[PDB]
Amino acid sequence: GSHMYLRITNIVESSFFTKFIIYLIVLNGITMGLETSKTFMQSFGVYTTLFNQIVITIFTIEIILRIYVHRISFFKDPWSLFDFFVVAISLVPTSSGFPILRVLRVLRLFRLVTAVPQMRKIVSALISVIPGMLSVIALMTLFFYIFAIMATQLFGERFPEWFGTLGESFYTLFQVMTLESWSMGIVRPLMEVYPYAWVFFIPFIFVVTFVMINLVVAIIVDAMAILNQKEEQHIIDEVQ
Amino acid sequence: GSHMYLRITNIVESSFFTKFIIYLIVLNGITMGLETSKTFMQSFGVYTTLFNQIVITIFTIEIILRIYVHRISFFKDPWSLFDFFVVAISLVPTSSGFPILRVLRVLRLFRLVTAVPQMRKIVSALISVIPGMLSVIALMTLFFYIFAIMATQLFGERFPEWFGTLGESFYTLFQVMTLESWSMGIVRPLMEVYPYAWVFFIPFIFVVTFVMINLVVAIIVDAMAILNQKEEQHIIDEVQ
Amino acid sequence: GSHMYLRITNIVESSFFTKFIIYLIVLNGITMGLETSKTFMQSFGVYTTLFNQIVITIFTIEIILRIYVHRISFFKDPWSLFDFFVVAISLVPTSSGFPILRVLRVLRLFRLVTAVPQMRKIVSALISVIPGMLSVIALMTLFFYIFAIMATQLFGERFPEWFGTLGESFYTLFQVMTLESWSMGIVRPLMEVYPYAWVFFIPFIFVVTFVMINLVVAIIVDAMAILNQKEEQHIIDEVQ
Amino acid sequence: GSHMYLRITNIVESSFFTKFIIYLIVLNGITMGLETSKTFMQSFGVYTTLFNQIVITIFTIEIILRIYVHRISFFKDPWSLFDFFVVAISLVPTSSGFPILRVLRVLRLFRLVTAVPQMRKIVSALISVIPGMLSVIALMTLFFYIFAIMATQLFGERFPEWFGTLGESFYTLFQVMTLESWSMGIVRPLMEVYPYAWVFFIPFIFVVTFVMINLVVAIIVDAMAILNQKEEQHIIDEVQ
Ligand SMILES: CCCCCCCCCCCCCC(=O)OC[C@H](COP(=O)(O)OCC[N+](C)(C)C)OC(=O)CCCCCCCCCCCCC
Ligand SMILES: CCCCCCCCCCCCCC(=O)OC[C@H](COP(=O)(O)OCC[N+](C)(C)C)OC(=O)CCCCCCCCCCCCC
Ligand SMILES: CCCCCCCCCCCCCC(=O)OC[C@H](COP(=O)(O)OCC[N+](C)(C)C)OC(=O)CCCCCCCCCCCCC
Ligand SMILES: CCCCCCCCCCCCCC(=O)OC[C@H](COP(=O)(O)OCC[N+](C)(C)C)OC(=O)CCCCCCCCCCCCC
């Protein structure tokens, strides 16, 4: 709370500021989708690479300004910590070799979430249910890891593409979970060498599906014992 | 409100009128399904092409009559705006070349919805939930568009059939969303050139599915906080 | 209500009677599953064909007895009308040529439903929800029939195996509904001749899925406005 | 209740005891996942086979101790009966030939459930709903067994890989239930010999899916007539 600090704060917390940031994001969005076309990039190539690092600096300025305003509440606000990390990624130069970092630039279009509250509310409601599932996710991951071990010991010999490695089984088992060609592509070929592989996979499909179903039925039915107690006491409220 | 206007209005708003329109629709339905057979079309070919443009004019007459009756309320009633556009399509002649317009004729069997209230009510209940999802659809589309860009930059070089174009990635990613041969057909071939493509697609499958599930759980659980407040206040109603 | 009529009725409505019928059904079940094996059928072949027509006559006797008891209430009780038709099928001899009728014999194992009330209750609860869906099924079938026509006109020329016939499109479209290899197997081959077939199928997948989801959300949420009014009035019951 | 019995009981029922057991389980978990790598097993091979039978004896000791404490309540506590059977499996030596028993060792990582109450509660909630489904599972299994018989009689001749055996049809039908390449892989090849096989499988897909959906809708809606009566009477509670 000072002279220039508060002058800054009026700009950062302003309508024009976020409007402009969003306005820029949508442009850099169309910019980055047009960068897809070599027809475009052959012609108007530099027009966009410049436009990008114009926007990167603006976003860096904007992040710096928001830090001076928000102090510690910036590095505990997830939506800002995202904007920090998602813009810092775009500041690591292409001079560092690793080819994907020039592609991680595009994640800065996710600012359209953190800077638009309609999206922020949806995103929050989806993350809101994850912590209740963290213990069901835990059992599933242990389930996968136990069956990843067994499959790597049972099938990775005669089938190394699918099971020769704990990870290759993890991927394959996750594909069995999606039911993606689990039978025609995996178990039926496995069965023409190991006749009983169906004893492994048919129960695995049963458990990992039946659990996924109860994960949802838990979410719904347990969400609505609350609406049936928040109502109950507010009906017991008005009966004395 | 006049002499002939009101004479017309009794016909348009009548039971016989809609009954006849529906009666015609069902016939032109069987007409258009029999037009499938060359055995039929070789024999009774003209019997149907005539029958069609008999029905088209009747439907044009009927649309004209309904406009004189309903005035502005016809061009704000969606069910009529449909009948308008769906019959106007059938009036663009096959003399205009574009081959599909002779196939868009069949959409005039969707009149059986707009002209039968039992269907109109179902259709209304399905469209009724879309506006609540428009913001979740928005995030998904941005999600797709961000990952469509990245995939087109990561894989369209060595895999142009699947990712060489922002649209080809959009289609492919939508196929990954359906889980349609996402692993055997796409990611496993991708991995034999790009070993880490699973880091791209396994999370994409996670997010785009987990969101689709919460879209439904939102629809159900939020629909029924209303039945638990419309009930609550009607229980608080009768306790004073 | 007589002398022999009532003597009969004590047997038909008895515990031993249904117990024996069920006891027989389970045996003819194992009989018919062992008829699968040629190893068995080569050895104990006649032991079962006899056993079957022993049970068929018993079931015919039992149906005749139940008709004399139940009079008109037998030909309006669905569970009996089933037992009637499902045993009458087993009485059409193999002397009539049509090869499948000797296989329709097996449907007489569905008696284990109609004769065991625990199953009858489940079956009733599943059929119970069908009549509410009959109008949503109606729209879907019209939707399929409209898009079956269009696809047969758009693709059956260059793709007769999938679309050359209104039925072949019906089957294919139902396979697109199941998402069974809809892209790799169907639309992607279609697109290498008709580049815009994705404009046909991607919306078709959208509608026919989005409707299937709302069919369930309708079932759940509407079932439980009843439990929230049967409760409400029974709470308004006790507040005067 | 004695001198040494109660000395033992303080150790078994202690925090350190279960903490140590869990601490060991997590190590033997990483041990067994590293046993996947031949690079590891070539080098530090004996380091783990020893470590395993160190843990097996500790778990045997621990099971023996828990039996002396818990007496009959150990052989009626499912979580212990599991630990008993899951460790007894690891005590059958590899000297008995059957190759899989050395792989069933890994199931002793499921102790991390029975020994961690956060997991035990989830597991209990998932098993909790199974007994309500036991009668719906029963009908499905009879449904499968009836259609497994018919398919083995209809298709196992010209298609022995898929239907030549009651079990091969069971597996195939379960794959049709998963919708795993049911059309492209199974029914479409069947139809190019048996043109009407779609009359078999399209209804089978209908029934076995429609039932699976009602299984869930039953679980949800019936779970919440209870929350709407446990609430109702607790609202009728406070209105006298
Ligand atoms: C209701 C619950 C729903 C979620 C259930 C989750 C079950 C467990 C995760 C399964 C996901 C499958 C992951 C997967 O693709 O595994 C591959 C990796 C890497 O192995 P790698 O050998 O590098 O890749 C094989 C392919 N290759 C050779 C061409 C590179 O394999 C590994 O390295 C092991 C992966 C273990 C993942 C554990 C992550 C932390 C806990 C789970 C968090 C999940 C997201 C919320
Ligand atoms: C819970 C949410 C569920 C819905 C999630 C929706 C996610 C976003 C839409 C994904 C649907 C996939 C669309 C698709 O097939 O994309 C293809 C098009 C055209 O690209 P194009 O390169 O012409 O086609 C490739 C194939 N080829 C070369 C043989 C012609 O690609 C494009 O041109 C871009 C398509 C962008 C669609 C944006 C439409 C407006 C917003 C989304 C509305 C969705 C329906 C309610
Ligand atoms: C939420 C709703 C879920 C249910 C949505 C149902 C949508 C409509 C039914 C779709 C089911 C697909 C039926 C199907 O496989 O169609 C094939 C038939 C026969 O055509 P056909 O050309 O004989 O068979 C082609 C294959 N071939 C040449 C090797 C014999 O094609 C036909 O002949 C036309 C079939 C029209 C079926 C209309 C049946 C009455 C109304 C729907 C009742 C559905 C069950 C409750
Ligand atoms: C809403 C309900 C959801 C659950 C629905 C369950 C429907 C019935 C079970 C279907 C599961 C499919 C089982 C399966 O893979 O069957 C194969 C077995 C063994 O036949 P087999 O000929 O040995 O294996 C064929 C493959 N080969 C030649 C390479 C070895 O086939 C048999 O031997 C017969 C299997 C009968 C299983 C009956 C088990 C007891 C009742 C069901 C319990 C299910 C788990 C809770």
Write the layout of secondary structure elements.
Four copies of one chain form a homotetramer.
Chain A lengths: L3 H9 L2 H20 L3 H6 L1 H26 L7 H12 L21 H4 L2 H38 L5 H4 L2 H12 L4 H10 L5 H27 L6 H7 L4
Helix pairs in contact in A: 1-4, 2-4, 4-5, 7-9, 7-11
PDB class: membrane protein
Keywords: Voltage-gated sodium channel Ion transport protein, membrane protein
Assembly: tetrameric
Please identify the oligomeric state: homotetramer
The largest interface is:
A-B, 42 and 40 residues
Number of domains of chain A: 2
Helix content of chain A: over 70%
User: Which architecture name of the largest domain in chain A does CATH use?
Assistant: Orthogonal Bundle
- Which class best fits the helix and strand makeup of chain A? mainly alpha
Instruction: Output the CATH class name of the largest domain in chain A.
Output: Mainly Alpha
What is the overall number of helices of chain A? 12
End-to-end CA span of chain A:
51 Å
Global morphology of chain A: flat
Query: Mind summarizing the main beta sheet of chain A?
Result: none
Taking all Cα atoms into account, the compactness measure Rg of chain A is 26 Å
How much beta of chain A, percentage-wise?
under 5%
Number of separate strands of chain A: 0
Instruction: Tell me which ligands are bound.
Output: 1,2-dimyristoyl-SN-glycero-3-phosphocholine
CATH topology assignment of the largest domain in chain A: Helix Hairpins
Q: Order of helices and strands of chain A, N to C?
A: HHHHHHHHHHHH
